[PDB]
Amino acid sequence: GYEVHHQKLVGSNKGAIIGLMVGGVVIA
Amino acid sequence: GYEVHHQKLVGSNKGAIIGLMVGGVVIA
Amino acid sequence: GYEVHHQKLVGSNKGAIIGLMVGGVVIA
Amino acid sequence: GYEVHHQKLVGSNKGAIIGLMVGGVVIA
Amino acid sequence: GYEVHHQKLVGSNKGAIIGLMVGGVVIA
Amino acid sequence: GYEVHHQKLVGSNKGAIIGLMVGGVVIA
Amino acid sequence: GYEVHHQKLVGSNKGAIIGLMVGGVVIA
Amino acid sequence: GYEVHHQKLVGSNKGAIIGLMVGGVVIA
Amino acid sequence: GYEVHHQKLVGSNKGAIIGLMVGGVVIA
Amino acid sequence: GYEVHHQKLVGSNKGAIIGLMVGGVVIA
Structure with missing residues (x-):
């Protein structure tokens, strides 16, 4: 499937x- | 599938x- | 499939x- | 500006x- | 600015x- | 500006x- | 500007x- | 400008x- | 399929x- | 298929x- 060795x-x-x-209502 | 060795x-x-x-309503 | 060695x-x-x-409504 | 009389x-x-x-990862 | 009379x-x-x-991971 | 009488x-x-x-990764 | 009487x-x-x-990656 | 009587x-x-x-990558 | 050695x-x-x-409505 | 050594x-x-x-409606 999904595989990773090393990450940040x-x-x-x-x-x-x-x-x-x-x-x-949303401001910024 | 999906594979990675090293990443940031x-x-x-x-x-x-x-x-x-x-x-x-959305502003900025 | 999808493969990468090193990335940022x-x-x-x-x-x-x-x-x-x-x-x-959206402004900016 | 923005004006409404009646709404649902x-x-x-x-x-x-x-x-x-x-x-x-997101599934469905 | 922003005005409404009646709403649900x-x-x-x-x-x-x-x-x-x-x-x-997110499922459904 | 923006004006409405009646809406759903x-x-x-x-x-x-x-x-x-x-x-x-996004599936469906 | 923008005006409507009745809508859905x-x-x-x-x-x-x-x-x-x-x-x-996006699938479907 | 923009005006409507009735719409869906x-x-x-x-x-x-x-x-x-x-x-x-995008699939379908 | 899709392969990369080094990227940013x-x-x-x-x-x-x-x-x-x-x-x-969208402004900017 | 698709292959790259180095890119930005x-x-x-x-x-x-x-x-x-x-x-x-879209403005700018």
Whole structure:
């Protein structure tokens, strides 16, 4: 399937992340 | 399938990320 | 299939990213 | 700006919604 | 700015919703 | 600007929705 | 600008939707 | 500008939709 | 299939990216 | 098939990118 020997990963949020939005308002 | 020996990954958000939007408003 | 020896990856958002939009408004 | 008199809104998820993904795996 | 007189809103999840994912696995 | 008298809206996910992806794998 | 008297809207996903992709793999 | 009396809209995805792609692979 | 020895990848958004849009409005 | 020894890739958005559009409006 999926195989990796050696790795380094980074994820970062500094803003807005939304899954499901109804009717709202998002700024920046 | 999918194979890798050595890697480095970065992901970053500094703005707005939305999955599913109904009727709302997004600024920047 | 898919094979790599050595790599570096970057992904960045500084604006608006939307999956599915109904009826709404996006500015920048 | 933005103006509405009368409305009805629905949003629904039955699958996978992701904002920011690094290195992972998504099935269906 | 933003104005509405009369409204009805619904949001529902029956699956997977994630903000920020590093290295994990999501099924359905 | 933006103006509406009367409306009905629906948004639905039954699959995969991703904002920002680095290096990962998506099936269906 | 933008004006509507009466309307009905539907949006649906049954597959894969991606905003920004780096290096990854999408099947269906 | 943009004006409508009466309308019905549908949008549907059954496959792969990508915004911005770097280096990756898409099947179907 | 797909094979690479050595590589560097960058992806960046500074504007609007949308997957599926119904009826909405996008500015910049 | 597809083979590379050494490479550098960049992708950038500074405007509007849309996958599938029904009935909406895009400015810039």
